Amino acid sequence: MRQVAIYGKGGIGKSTTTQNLTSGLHAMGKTIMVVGCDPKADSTRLLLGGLAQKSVLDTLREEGEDVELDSILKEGYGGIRCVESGGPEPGVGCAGRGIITSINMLEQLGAYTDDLDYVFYDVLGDVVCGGFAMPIREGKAQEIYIVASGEMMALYAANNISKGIQKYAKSGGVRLGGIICNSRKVANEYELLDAFAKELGSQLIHFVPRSPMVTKAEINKQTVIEYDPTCEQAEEYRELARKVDANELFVIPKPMTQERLEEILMQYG
Amino acid sequence: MRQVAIYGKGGIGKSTTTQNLTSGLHAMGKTIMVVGCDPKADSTRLLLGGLAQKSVLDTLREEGEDVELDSILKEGYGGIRCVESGGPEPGVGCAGRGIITSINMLEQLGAYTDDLDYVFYDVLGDVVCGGFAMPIREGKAQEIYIVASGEMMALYAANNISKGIQKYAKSGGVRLGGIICNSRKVANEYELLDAFAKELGSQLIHFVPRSPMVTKAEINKQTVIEYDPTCEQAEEYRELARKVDANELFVIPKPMTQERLEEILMQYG
Numbered sequence: 155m156r157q158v159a160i161y162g163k164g165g166i167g168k169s170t171t172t173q174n175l176t177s178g179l180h181a182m183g184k185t186i187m188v189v190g191c192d193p194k195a196d197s198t199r200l201l202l203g204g205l206a207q208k209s210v211l212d213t214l215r216e217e218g219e220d221v222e223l224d225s226i227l228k229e230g231y232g233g234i235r236c237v238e239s240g241g242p243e244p245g246v247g248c249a250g251r252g253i254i255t256s257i258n259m260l261e262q263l264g265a266y267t268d269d270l271d272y273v274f275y276d277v278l279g280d281v282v283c284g285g286f287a288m289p290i291r292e293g294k295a296q297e298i299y300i301v302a303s304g305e306m307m308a309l310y311a312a313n314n315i316s317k318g319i320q321k322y323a324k325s326g327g328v329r330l331g332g333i334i335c336n337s338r339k340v341a342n343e344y345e346l347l348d349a350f351a352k353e354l355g356s357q358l359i360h361f362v363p364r365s366p367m368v369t370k371a372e373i374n375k376q377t378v379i380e381y382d383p384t385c386e387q388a389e390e391y392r393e394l395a396r397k398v399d400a401n402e403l404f405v406i407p408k409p410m411t412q413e414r415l416e417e418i419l420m421q422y423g
Numbered sequence: 424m425r426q427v428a429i430y431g432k433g434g435i436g437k438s439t440t441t442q443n444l445t446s447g448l449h450a451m452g453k454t455i456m457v458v459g460c461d462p463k464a465d466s467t468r469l470l471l472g473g474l475a476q477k478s479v480l481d482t483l484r485e486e487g488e489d490v491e492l493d494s495i496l497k498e499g500y501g502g503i504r505c506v507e508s509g510g511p512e513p514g515v516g517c518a519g520r521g522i523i524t525s526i527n528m529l530e531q532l533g534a535y536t537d538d539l540d541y542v543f544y545d546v547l548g549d550v551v552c553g554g555f556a557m558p559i560r561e562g563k564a565q566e567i568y569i570v571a572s573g574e575m576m577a578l579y580a581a582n583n584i585s586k587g588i589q590k591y592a593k594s595g596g597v598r599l600g601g602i603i604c605n606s607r608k609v610a611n612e613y614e615l616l617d618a619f620a621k622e623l624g625s626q627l628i629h630f631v632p633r634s635p636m637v638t639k640a641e642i643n644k645q646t647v648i649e650y651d652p653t654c655e656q657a658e659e660y661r662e663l664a665r666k667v668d669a670n671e672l673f674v675i676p677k678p679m680t681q682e683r684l685e686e687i688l689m690q691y692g
């Protein structure tokens with residue numbers, strides 16, 4: 155079973171990419187589980203159709219000790235099994251800690267079934283603290299893909315995420331499978347991202363194009379593959395899916411200095 | 424001395440407003456100290472004329488134990504004392520721990536002097552966790568201002584931040600002083616920001632407009648008052664300052680429901 159995690163700054167469509175990627179993997183005959191660990195994004199909404207399914211932390215406080223799997227895991231588009239961690243008690247508590255609670259409650263309720271081809275953790279990368287690195291540090295996530303756009307703050311976060319990955323790439327076997335560009339503009343910043351990823355010693359595994367369809371599917375609470383399998387954008391996601399599935403490039407990333415960041419920005423951005 | 428914290432999500436210029444606000448109070452003969460607690464932007468880079476001061480954490484790493492106050496606190500614009508707590512070691516440290524370390528050092532090095540009119544903690548609003556609630560939790564900050572814009576994610580963060588505020592108001596002196604709008608070109612933004620702040624039991628203390636004045640000053644790494652004092656945007660900040668200094672509305676905020684917020688973003692465009 156591939157235990158993948160998608161990290162990246164908020165505000166750049168990271169959860170939408172993660173969800174769309176799974177439909178692409180489903181289009182390949184894959185059995186997949188998705189676990190949202192992003193208190194700022196609905197991680198399974200495009201897969202379950204507008205249903206902001208109830209979180210694990212929320213189910214506990216009501217289903218208490220007798221919680222049943224089917225309450226926390228809902229089957230979405232194409233059979234993709236969907237779950238949501240739920241955030242930290244506002245102002246107290248640790249998101250990282252609650253992502254741990256949920257994951258352990260999943261194993262405990264036997265959610266990690268031998269038919270799983272994939273499990274994805276959609277993790278917020280705004281704060282790259284020990285709380286958000288929980289899935290990597292605990293061995294839950296071995297293969298990470300970072301989502302970034304050709305903007306400084308998304309590149310900075312990606313670099314930072316790689317710093318955290320790097321620290322665990324040793325004791326554990328977590329590695330970076332690649333960077334995914336979520337084009338946020340008409341300016342195809344393919345070259346910046348490609349340079350940024352190669353500099354880490356990784357690769358731009360796929361460049362997700364700016365499309366007005368992502369927005370339609372989204373309004374309609376669906377992934378582009380559920381909403382309209384025939385468009386170009388649908389093929390984009392199928393292509394991202396196949397490259398992740400076929401991927402053999404797994405590395406201990408080499409973070410860059412801020413200065414190096416700036417140089418890449420100038421030379422390729 | 425007024426102990427204020429400025430919370431808000433990143434990506435909407437919260438730190439630029441913090442620095443610009445202090446500038447205004449400087450204009451009022453106010454003696455001020457700024458403590459950056461936000462991994463996202465440089466909370467003092469505009470006060471220090473574009474100077475990226477080392478952080479408390481960097482510094483301690485460097486200067487070790489023998490930490491000098493003058494190394495960590497730098498006087499910038501009009502005498503404003505600047506300090507940056509430094510972010511967490513990527514993948515390991517909790518953002519809160521560093522905040523507490525820094526505040527203790529400042530206290531230990533006698534930075535909390537009698538001549539202080541204000542101390543501001545510029546804090547990240549992306550995750551309303553205990554790590555980020557450290558200035559509040561440690562008692563340090565009793566007066567809160569949340570920076571938001573018409574964007575939905577900004578209002579959600581603001582609402583989420585108010586939950587954390589309320590967790591401590593009812594037992595600590597912590598109160599919400601108001602909502603500050605960093606305008607993001609939103610149709611009917613003002614009426615919307617005012618209904619939101621009102622919904623919480625608070626007020627839209629000031630609407631900061633977008634102007635090419637801010638983008639210029641930050642290319643040079645200055646605050647606007649500093650740039651052209653005669654300038655409406657610099658005057659915008661002076662008004663912001665006199666409105667905060669004279670403020671008398673300080674409340675235990677009433678977080679609204681997700682449905683209550685979506686209603687408002689429906690009713691207000």
Ligand code: SF4
Nearest residue numbers: 248283285517552554
């Ligand atoms: S480790 Fe991170 S999520 Fe946990 S309390 Fe600290 S800053 Fe917050």
